[PDB]
């Protein structure tokens, strides 16, 4: 079973402290892309990985527990399929014209202004986004959507955030 | 006279397009740390540099203009001296105990809870923070305080934000 299969994966990846650190995450993500010649990437760097862990570390242990890793891992597998699916010219990267359809397929309906800002921060000079950049951006987008949703208690579409909360959300990510 | 030297620096750095890109920033930053012995870094990576440019890119051109680069360059020169001043055990890195004093010298007064989060995200090893992690952290902290202050006209210590604004603030960084 996939549940039995996942505990085994996590158990082996987590190791001695029973949690997945940024380094352990980096190593497994780099092993995976190595098996996919259709995914162009300069590799998952340690900083990108420290960022992914921080943003997914709900309980501030500094590392990823079973549930935190299960959530991240399931998303990455779903997003990896979308990436292959929307790279219609097989450039191994998500071009600017390919980006909106890929994000929308992922469940994020943004606007032209936001898509342009995403491209300015996450794509290269040619306007192309490689695999590690794509996954890194989606992990953060999903987390920022979840953070806003949880702060929007009244369902008014506006949130109030104090300086302490602001610093915690932006610095630990 | 010190501004005639800087104009020459920016021009030769900015090149054909008259703006410093994340790539251009990475090169200059890695040349500098080489001609600086006990500063310890694993080098300035492209993701870290893409992040520093995004946070400093006020006019959304995607790159650093003269004034945007000037502000950044001066802070780095100011923060590098603090890094050296506070690395009392001359380990070439900023440890847990050395951190609060260095940030206080930069003008930041944060609580211990915020410091523990910063150490998990930027040090997390033996609690030591190398040079690129230190500068990266401060560039972001400075930008996040400046961002918050812009929306909180006449200090209430709280900002009100909708989803578009929230995504612009948290994703374009
Ligand atoms: Ca572990
Ligand atoms: Ca955790
Ligand atoms: Ca493509
Ligand atoms: Ca990349
Ligand atoms: Ca340039
Ligand atoms: Ca600019
Ligand atoms: Ca030290
Ligand atoms: Ca580093």
Coordinates of C-alpha atoms and ligand atoms in Angstrom, one line a residue:
Chain A
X1 CA 0.0 0.0 0.0
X2 CA 1.0 3.6 -0.7
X3 CA 0.5 4.4 3.1
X4 CA 2.9 1.6 4.1
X5 CA 5.2 2.7 1.2
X6 CA 5.2 6.3 2.4
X7 CA 6.0 5.5 6.1
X8 CA 9.0 3.5 4.9
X9 CA 10.2 6.4 2.7
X10 CA 9.8 8.9 5.4
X11 CA 11.3 6.6 8.0
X12 CA 14.4 6.2 5.9
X13 CA 14.7 9.8 4.9
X14 CA 14.0 11.3 8.4
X15 CA 16.7 9.2 10.1
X16 CA 17.8 9.5 13.7
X17 CA 15.9 12.6 14.7
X18 CA 12.7 11.4 13.0
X19 CA 12.4 14.6 11.1
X20 CA 13.4 15.8 7.6
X21 CA 15.9 18.7 7.6
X22 CA 16.6 21.0 4.7
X23 CA 19.6 18.9 3.8
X24 CA 17.7 15.6 3.8
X25 CA 15.0 17.2 1.7
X26 CA 17.6 18.6 -0.8
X27 CA 19.2 15.2 -1.2
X28 CA 16.0 13.4 -2.0
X29 CA 14.7 16.1 -4.4
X30 CA 18.0 16.0 -6.3
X31 CA 17.8 12.2 -6.5
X32 CA 14.4 12.4 -8.0
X33 CA 15.1 15.0 -10.7
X34 CA 18.1 12.9 -11.7
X35 CA 15.6 10.2 -13.0
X36 CA 13.7 12.7 -15.2
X37 CA 15.6 13.9 -18.2
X38 CA 12.5 15.9 -19.2
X39 CA 12.8 18.2 -16.2
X40 CA 15.4 21.0 -16.8
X41 CA 16.9 22.4 -13.5
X42 CA 20.2 23.7 -12.0
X43 CA 19.3 21.5 -9.0
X44 CA 17.7 22.2 -5.6
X45 CA 20.0 24.4 -3.6
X46 CA 20.3 24.4 0.1
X47 CA 18.8 27.9 0.5
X48 CA 15.7 27.1 -1.6
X49 CA 15.3 24.0 0.6
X50 CA 15.7 25.9 3.9
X51 CA 13.0 28.1 2.6
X52 CA 10.6 25.2 1.7
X53 CA 11.1 23.7 5.2
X54 CA 10.5 26.9 7.1
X55 CA 7.3 27.6 5.2
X56 CA 6.1 24.0 5.8
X57 CA 7.2 23.8 9.4
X58 CA 3.8 24.6 11.1
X59 CA 5.1 23.5 14.5
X60 CA 8.4 25.4 14.4
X61 CA 10.5 22.3 15.2
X62 CA 12.9 23.6 12.5
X63 CA 12.4 20.3 10.5
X64 CA 9.5 18.5 8.9
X65 CA 7.5 15.9 10.8
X66 CA 5.5 13.0 9.2
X67 CA 2.4 15.1 8.5
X68 CA 4.3 18.1 7.3
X69 CA 6.4 16.0 4.9
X70 CA 3.4 14.0 3.7
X71 CA 1.6 17.3 2.7
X72 CA 4.7 18.7 0.9
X73 CA 5.5 15.4 -0.8
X74 CA 2.0 14.8 -2.2
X75 CA 1.9 18.3 -3.6
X76 CA 5.3 18.0 -5.3
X77 CA 4.2 14.8 -7.0
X78 CA 1.0 16.5 -8.2
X79 CA 2.8 19.6 -9.4
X80 CA 5.6 17.6 -11.1
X81 CA 2.9 16.0 -13.3
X82 CA 1.4 19.4 -14.2
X83 CA 4.9 20.7 -15.1
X84 CA 5.4 17.9 -17.6
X85 CA 1.9 18.4 -18.9
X86 CA 2.3 22.1 -19.5
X87 CA 5.7 22.1 -21.0
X88 CA 4.2 21.7 -24.5
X89 CA 7.3 22.5 -26.5
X90 CA 9.5 20.1 -24.4
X91 CA 12.0 22.9 -23.4
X92 CA 12.1 21.2 -20.0
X93 CA 11.1 24.6 -18.5
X94 CA 7.8 26.5 -18.1
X95 CA 7.8 29.5 -20.5
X96 CA 5.8 32.6 -19.8
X97 CA 3.0 31.6 -22.1
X98 CA 2.9 28.2 -20.4
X99 CA 2.8 29.5 -16.9
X100 CA -0.9 30.6 -16.5
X101 CA -2.3 27.3 -17.6
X102 CA 0.0 25.4 -15.4
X103 CA -0.8 27.5 -12.3
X104 CA -4.5 27.3 -13.0
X105 CA -4.3 23.5 -13.4
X106 CA -2.7 23.6 -9.9
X107 CA -5.7 25.4 -8.6
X108 CA -4.4 29.0 -8.5
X109 CA -6.3 31.5 -10.5
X110 CA -4.3 34.7 -10.3
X111 CA -4.4 37.7 -12.6
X112 CA -2.1 39.1 -15.2
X113 CA -0.4 41.5 -12.8
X114 CA 0.4 38.7 -10.4
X115 CA 1.6 36.3 -13.1
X116 CA 4.0 39.0 -14.3
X117 CA 5.4 39.6 -10.8
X118 CA 5.9 35.9 -10.4
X119 CA 7.8 35.7 -13.7
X120 CA 10.0 38.7 -12.7
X121 CA 11.0 37.0 -9.4
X122 CA 11.0 33.3 -10.4
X123 CA 11.9 33.1 -14.1
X124 CA 15.2 33.7 -15.8
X125 CA 16.0 36.4 -18.4
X126 CA 14.3 34.5 -21.2
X127 CA 11.2 34.4 -19.1
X128 CA 11.7 30.6 -18.4
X129 CA 11.1 28.9 -15.1
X130 CA 13.0 25.7 -14.4
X131 CA 11.8 22.8 -12.2
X132 CA 13.3 23.8 -8.8
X133 CA 12.1 27.4 -9.3
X134 CA 8.6 26.2 -10.2
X135 CA 8.3 23.9 -7.2
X136 CA 9.8 26.5 -4.9
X137 CA 7.3 29.1 -6.0
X138 CA 4.3 26.8 -5.8
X139 CA 5.2 25.7 -2.3
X140 CA 5.3 29.3 -1.1
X141 CA 2.1 30.4 -3.0
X142 CA 0.2 27.5 -1.5
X143 CA 1.5 28.4 2.0
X144 CA 0.7 32.1 1.5
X145 CA -2.8 31.3 0.4
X146 CA -3.2 29.1 3.5
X147 CA -1.8 31.8 5.8
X148 CA -4.2 34.4 4.4
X149 CA -7.2 32.0 4.6
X150 CA -6.5 31.3 8.2
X151 CA -6.2 35.0 9.1
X152 CA -9.5 35.8 7.3
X153 CA -11.6 34.7 10.2
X154 CA -14.6 36.9 9.3
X155 CA -14.7 36.0 5.6
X156 CA -14.4 39.7 4.6
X157 CA -11.4 39.2 2.3
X158 CA -9.2 41.6 4.3
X159 CA -6.8 40.6 7.1
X160 CA -5.2 42.6 9.8
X161 CA -1.6 41.7 10.7
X162 CA 0.5 43.2 13.4
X163 CA 4.3 43.7 13.1
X164 CA 5.2 40.7 15.2
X165 CA 3.0 38.4 13.1
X166 CA 4.3 40.1 9.9
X167 CA 7.9 39.5 10.9
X168 CA 7.3 35.9 11.8
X169 CA 5.5 35.1 8.5
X170 CA 8.0 36.8 6.2
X171 CA 11.2 35.9 8.1
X172 CA 10.5 32.3 8.8
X173 CA 10.0 31.3 5.2
Chain B
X1 CA 34.8 61.9 -4.8
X2 CA 33.5 58.7 -3.2
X3 CA 30.5 59.0 -5.5
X4 CA 32.6 59.4 -8.6
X5 CA 34.1 56.0 -7.7
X6 CA 30.7 54.4 -7.2
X7 CA 29.3 55.7 -10.4
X8 CA 32.2 54.1 -12.2
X9 CA 31.5 50.9 -10.2
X10 CA 27.8 50.8 -11.1
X11 CA 28.4 51.6 -14.8
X12 CA 30.9 48.8 -15.3
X13 CA 28.7 46.4 -13.2
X14 CA 25.4 47.3 -14.8
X15 CA 26.6 47.0 -18.4
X16 CA 24.5 47.3 -21.6
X17 CA 21.1 47.6 -20.0
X18 CA 22.2 50.0 -17.3
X19 CA 20.7 47.8 -14.5
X20 CA 22.3 45.2 -12.3
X21 CA 20.6 41.8 -12.6
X22 CA 20.7 39.0 -10.1
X23 CA 23.5 37.4 -12.1
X24 CA 25.6 40.6 -12.2
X25 CA 25.0 41.0 -8.4
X26 CA 26.1 37.4 -7.8
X27 CA 29.4 37.9 -9.6
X28 CA 30.4 41.1 -7.8
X29 CA 29.5 39.6 -4.4
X30 CA 31.5 36.5 -4.9
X31 CA 34.5 38.5 -6.0
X32 CA 34.4 40.5 -2.9
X33 CA 34.2 37.6 -0.4
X34 CA 37.2 36.0 -2.1
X35 CA 39.3 39.0 -1.3
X36 CA 38.2 38.7 2.4
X37 CA 39.9 35.8 4.3
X38 CA 38.0 35.0 7.5
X39 CA 34.5 35.8 6.5
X40 CA 33.4 32.2 5.8
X41 CA 30.6 31.6 3.2
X42 CA 29.7 28.8 0.8
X43 CA 29.3 31.7 -1.7
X44 CA 26.3 33.8 -2.9
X45 CA 24.0 31.5 -4.8
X46 CA 21.7 32.6 -7.7
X47 CA 18.5 32.0 -5.7
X48 CA 19.7 34.2 -2.8
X49 CA 20.7 36.9 -5.3
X50 CA 17.4 36.6 -7.2
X51 CA 15.7 37.1 -3.8
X52 CA 17.9 40.2 -2.9
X53 CA 17.1 41.9 -6.2
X54 CA 13.3 41.2 -5.9
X55 CA 13.2 42.8 -2.4
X56 CA 15.2 45.8 -3.5
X57 CA 13.4 46.3 -6.9
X58 CA 11.2 49.3 -6.0
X59 CA 10.2 50.2 -9.6
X60 CA 9.5 46.6 -10.7
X61 CA 12.0 46.7 -13.6
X62 CA 13.2 43.2 -12.4
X63 CA 16.7 44.6 -11.9
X64 CA 18.6 47.1 -9.7
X65 CA 18.8 50.7 -10.9
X66 CA 21.5 53.1 -9.8
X67 CA 19.6 54.3 -6.6
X68 CA 18.3 50.8 -5.8
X69 CA 21.8 49.4 -6.1
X70 CA 23.3 52.3 -4.2
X71 CA 21.0 51.7 -1.1
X72 CA 21.8 48.0 -1.2
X73 CA 25.6 48.4 -1.7
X74 CA 25.9 50.8 1.3
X75 CA 24.0 48.5 3.6
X76 CA 26.2 45.6 2.6
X77 CA 29.3 47.7 3.3
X78 CA 27.8 48.7 6.7
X79 CA 26.8 45.1 7.6
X80 CA 30.0 43.5 6.6
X81 CA 31.9 45.7 9.2
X82 CA 29.3 44.7 11.9
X83 CA 29.8 41.0 11.0
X84 CA 33.6 41.4 11.5
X85 CA 33.2 43.5 14.6
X86 CA 30.8 41.1 16.3
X87 CA 32.6 37.8 15.4
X88 CA 34.5 38.0 18.6
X89 CA 35.7 34.4 18.5
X90 CA 37.0 35.1 15.1
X91 CA 35.4 32.0 13.7
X92 CA 34.5 33.8 10.5
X93 CA 30.8 33.2 11.3
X94 CA 28.1 34.7 13.6
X95 CA 27.0 32.4 16.4
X96 CA 23.8 32.3 18.5
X97 CA 25.4 34.4 21.2
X98 CA 27.0 36.9 18.8
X99 CA 23.7 37.4 16.7
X100 CA 21.6 39.7 19.0
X101 CA 24.5 42.2 19.4
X102 CA 25.2 42.3 15.6
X103 CA 21.5 42.9 14.8
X104 CA 21.2 45.5 17.6
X105 CA 24.2 47.3 16.0
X106 CA 22.3 47.2 12.7
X107 CA 19.3 48.8 14.5
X108 CA 17.0 45.8 15.0
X109 CA 15.4 45.0 18.3
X110 CA 13.6 41.6 18.1
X111 CA 12.4 39.3 20.8
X112 CA 13.9 35.9 21.6
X113 CA 11.1 34.1 19.8
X114 CA 11.9 35.9 16.5
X115 CA 15.6 35.2 17.0
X116 CA 15.0 31.4 17.4
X117 CA 13.1 31.4 14.1
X118 CA 15.9 33.3 12.4
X119 CA 18.5 30.9 13.7
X120 CA 16.4 27.9 12.5
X121 CA 16.1 29.4 9.0
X122 CA 19.5 31.0 8.5
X123 CA 22.0 29.2 10.8
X124 CA 20.5 25.9 11.9
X125 CA 23.6 23.7 12.3
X126 CA 25.6 24.7 15.4
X127 CA 23.7 28.0 15.4
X128 CA 26.4 29.6 13.2
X129 CA 25.5 31.9 10.3
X130 CA 27.9 32.4 7.5
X131 CA 28.4 35.7 5.6
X132 CA 26.0 35.2 2.7
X133 CA 23.2 34.0 5.0
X134 CA 23.8 37.0 7.3
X135 CA 23.6 39.6 4.5
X136 CA 20.6 37.8 2.9
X137 CA 18.8 37.8 6.2
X138 CA 19.5 41.5 6.9
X139 CA 18.5 42.6 3.4
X140 CA 15.2 40.8 3.8
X141 CA 14.6 42.1 7.4
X142 CA 15.3 45.7 6.4
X143 CA 12.9 45.3 3.4
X144 CA 10.1 43.7 5.5
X145 CA 10.3 46.6 8.1
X146 CA 10.3 49.2 5.3
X147 CA 7.3 47.5 3.6
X148 CA 5.3 47.3 6.8
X149 CA 6.0 51.0 7.7
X150 CA 4.7 52.0 4.3
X151 CA 1.3 50.5 4.9
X152 CA 1.0 51.5 8.5
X153 CA 1.0 55.3 8.1
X154 CA 1.4 56.8 11.5
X155 CA 2.2 53.8 13.6
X156 CA -0.7 51.7 14.8
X157 CA 1.5 48.6 14.5
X158 CA -1.1 46.8 12.3
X159 CA -1.8 46.7 8.6
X160 CA -4.9 45.7 6.7
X161 CA -4.5 43.8 3.5
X162 CA -6.5 42.0 0.8
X163 CA -5.3 38.9 -1.1
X164 CA -3.7 40.7 -4.1
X165 CA -1.7 43.0 -1.8
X166 CA -0.8 40.1 0.4
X167 CA 0.5 38.0 -2.5
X168 CA 2.5 41.0 -3.8
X169 CA 4.1 41.6 -0.4
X170 CA 4.9 38.0 0.3
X171 CA 5.7 36.5 -3.1
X172 CA 7.7 39.4 -4.7
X173 CA 10.5 38.9 -2.2
Ligands
LIG1 CA1 16.6 13.9 10.0
LIG2 CA1 8.0 20.7 12.0
LIG3 CA1 8.3 24.9 -22.2
LIG4 CA1 16.5 26.8 -10.7
LIG5 CA1 22.9 44.7 -16.5
LIG6 CA1 14.4 48.3 -10.4
LIG7 CA1 31.9 33.8 15.7
LIG8 CA1 25.6 30.4 3.2

